[PDB]
Design a protein around this ligand. Structure first.
Ligand code: BLA
Ligand code: CL
Ligand code: MG
Length: 284
């Protein structure tokens, strides 16, 4: 399949809810060839009144590799979930995360979870049946997933990719409907709290997202770290001063470096840790 189709869908839909404007990042991140010149990375970026950054990375290889990383980051005044689509596809295999990632914790407290997901449980139920739970995964990743997350692995077929496309569109339209209803925060302390929550999220992903190894192989370590911190998770430098180890001290090694492990806990949650009503039940 061509994930460019989905980027086109999303930009068109967004422009019926607001007006996108070009991000300044478009002058520094647009097109990049891999070191062996066989793979092209295509990058797009935009902003809007409530959206700090809407950005896509699309990778098409002559080998069958197709990658989409598409995200919408809100301005800290709008405590919206972060829209997240991370599709890693090869000739035969698909490894997929699609979610409205919660800005604030939905595990211990209830207010934010009810505010944003109460009316989306049926949407998550629709696709959890069609795109089955992907199995055990990095336990720290669940800190960032919503009760409607689609985490799935599947073999390539016309039917499975058709379902994936329908899910992306349904989930992105749901997120745009949340954006419609997002009113700006006026309390300065709350804006700071929303900003730290976003910075913590960007800091986690810029350090530990699974795609970083593939990027490093394609364009080398130096440019990959640049694309990761200044484009994909732009804001890790500007929205806060805390380091990855400030937020996640469990990863501090005996020498003060960040532990090479992706997961300090280990991979867990062999079954979906939310029940059919979206209540967290997580075992292992
Ligand atoms: C907080 C948010 C968040 C997201 C979105 C995410 C996705 C994610 N990607 C995975 C695999 C994978 N993902 C990729 C590749 C890519 N993947 C991409 O998203 C891109 C852009 C590429 C390529 C450039 C590969 C190659 C694997 C399998 C190998 C591995 O697990 O390293 C896994 C399973 C491995 C694990 O359990 O760690 C998850 C949960 N995890 C998170 O914590
Ligand atoms: Cl694997
Ligand atoms: Mg070259």
């Amino acid at each position: 399949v061509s994930y460019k189709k989905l980027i086109h869908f999303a930009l068109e839909e967004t422009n019926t809810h607001t007006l996108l404007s070009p991000s300044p990042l478009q002058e520094k991140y647009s097109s990049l060839l891999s070191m062996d010149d066989k793979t092209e990375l295509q990058m797009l970026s935009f902003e809007a009144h409530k959206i700090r950054l809407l950005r896509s990375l699309c990778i098409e290889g002559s080998d069958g590799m197709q990658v989409l990383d598409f995200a919408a980051f809100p301005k800290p005044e709008f405590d919206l979930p972060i829209f997240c689509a991370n599709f890693f596809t090869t000739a035969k295999m698909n490894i997929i995360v699609l979610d409205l990632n919660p800005l604030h914790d939905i595990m211990d407290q209830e207010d934010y979870k009810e505010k944003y997901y109460k009316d989306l449980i049926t949407l998550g139920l629709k696709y959890s049946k069609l795109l089955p739970w992907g199995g055990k995964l990095t336990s720290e990743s669940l800190r960032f997933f919503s009760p409607i997350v689609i985490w799935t692995r599947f073999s390539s077929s016309p039917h499975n990719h058709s379902v994936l496309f329908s899910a992306f569109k349904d989930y992105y339209q749901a997120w745009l409907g949340l954006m419609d209803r997002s009113e700006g925060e006026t309390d300065a302390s709350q804006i700071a709290c929303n900003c730290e929550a976003q910075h913590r999220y960007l800091t986690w992903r810029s350090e530990k997202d699974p795609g970083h190894g593939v990027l490093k192989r394609l364009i080398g370590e130096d440019l990959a770290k640049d694309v990761i911190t200044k484009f994909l998770f732009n804001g890790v430098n500007e929205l806060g001063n805390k380091t990855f180890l400030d937020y996640f001290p469990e990863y501090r090694c005996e020498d003060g470096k960040v532990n090479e492990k992706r997961s300090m806990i280990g991979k867990s949650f062999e079954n979906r840790p939310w029940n059919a009503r979206g209540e967290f039940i997580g075992d292992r």
